[PDB]
């Protein structure tokens, strides 16, 4: 009983830490990908801006 009980406390300790890590893993994925979407967005804008710059250079 004493051995099971000491395994259960430890297993419950590890479990408690686990859900903190899973919430923090989820928020780490969500932020990584949101930044990646925003990074892509900024890349489409530089790419347009360049082209307008290259069209403007021929005009200039």
């Amino acid at each position: 009983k004493h051995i099971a009980e000491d395994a259960d406390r430890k297993y419950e300790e590890v479990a408690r830490k686990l859900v903190i890590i899973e919430s923090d893993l989820e928020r780490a994925e969500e932020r990584a990908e949101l930044s990646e979407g925003k990074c892509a967005e900024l890349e489409e804008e530089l790419k347009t801006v360049t082209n307008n710059l290259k069209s403007l250079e021929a005009q200039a």
Binding site: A15, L18, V19, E22, E26, E29
Partner: protein, 372 residues
């Protein structure tokens, strides 16, 4: 604040206790029993009805029946014997001093919500009560306000998209398959192997087997092949009267019915199909968070290896730019009760209760004004 009794209306395990605690105080079988014959015991006092661990241990004298079948209350008189056992035997407290929180499936019948409400105020004399969807509590227990829950409970499976508060009432999807019919199915397919079972006293061991030995395969054809090509997909179980039985491919076949309801003559779509068909009803700017946060809930989701299977299945259905993740809580069997235990402890929630005064002013109809 007043201590709220949180009762999980589970179709195979009742879960019960006080609010403000991290885990349930009582976890016992959803069973009620009555004598098989006139005259029932000698040398000790006879009883007209039996419940829980007393019914599970003193079993042979009893016609056992189940108060909740298929996620629905099927006999009021047995649901009252669970609740009388819960307050006075299990927690040993007066319910007339405590608010009560009841768990429910989505789309719960109005007549059933009313008969439960009425029983609480007139059989058990409660000062206050509330009723809440299983998935909403499981999501709140997880530390979240937005996501879709695959609540594969004891008696039914539901798909429940939720955003910044309540579930989306038009988008919810149902399947009449979970842990209840899984036992009856397991028992059929064992008879087919030649381990015939007939007694409901055998069915409850088959139930235990199912909970211990079933596992969700990641690939159904490849595991099926493995079992056909080798006997390494079989685990022994020694029955409680000796006799070593061998449980084969039935381990993964039993739960396979969740993905392919045509295995048991049903017309319905599977748990992954009804997940996708639910999220596709949601608004596009919230589809992002719903696809990203697919949450598992209920007893039927505690089979190992389920996440890799569900991750697969949903990515195959849904397009590859809402970035899917399965969220599986550490103790996802209990997250409904834990969510009720957390929610009922908050100072913001004490305005939500149905009071005895509102029941005196409006009758059983009050639950459809106060619940969401």
């Amino acid at each position: 604040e007043t201590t709220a009794l949180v009762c999980d209306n589970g179709s195979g395990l009742v879960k019960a206790g006080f609010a403000g605690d991290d885990a349930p105080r009582a976890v016992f079988p959803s069973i009620v029993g009555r004598p098989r014959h006139q005259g029932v015991m000698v040398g000790m006092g006879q009883k007209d009805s039996y419940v829980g661990d007393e019914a599970q241990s003193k079993r042979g004298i009893l016609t056992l029946k189940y108060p909740i079948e298929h996620g629905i209350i099927t006999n009021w008189d047995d649901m009252e014997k669970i609740w009388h056992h819960t307050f006075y035997n299990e927690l040993r407290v007066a319910p007339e001093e405590h608010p009560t929180l009841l768990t429910e499936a989505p789309l719960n019948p109005k007549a059933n919500r009313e008969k439960m409400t009425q029983i609480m105020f007139e059989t058990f004399n409660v000062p206050a009560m509330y009723v809440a969807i299983q998935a909403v509590l499981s999501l709140y227990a997880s530390g979240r306000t937005t996501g879709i829950v695959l609540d594969s409970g004891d008696g039914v499976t539901h798909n429940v998209p939720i955003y910044e508060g309540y579930a989306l009432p038009h988008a919810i999807m149902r399947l009449d398959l979970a842990g209840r019919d899984l036992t009856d199915y397991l028992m059929k397919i064992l008879t087919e192997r030649g381990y015939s079972f007939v007694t409901t006293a055998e069915r409850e061991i088959v139930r235990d087997i199912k909970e211990k030995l079933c596992y969700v395969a990641l690939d159904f054809e490849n595991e099926m092949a493995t079992a056909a090509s080798s006997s390494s997909l079989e685990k022994s179980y020694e029955l409680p009267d000796g006799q070593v039985i061998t449980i084969g491919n039935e381990r993964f076949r039993c739960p396979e019915t969740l993905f392919q309801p045509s295995f048991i003559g049903m017309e319905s779509a599977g748990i992954h199909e009804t997940t996708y068909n639910s999220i596709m009803k949601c608004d596009i700017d919230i589809r992002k968070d719903l696809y990203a946060n697919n949450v598992l809930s209920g007893g039927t989701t505690m089979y190992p290896g389920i996440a890799d299977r569900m991750q697969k299945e949903i990515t195959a259905l849904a397009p590859s730019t809402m970035k899917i993740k399965i969220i599986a809580p550490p103790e996802r069997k209990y997250s409904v009760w834990i969510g009720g235990s957390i929610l009922a402890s908050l100072s913001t929630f004490q305005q939500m209760w149905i009071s005895k005064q509102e029941y005196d002013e409006a009758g059983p109809s009050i639950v459809h004004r106060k619940c969401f």
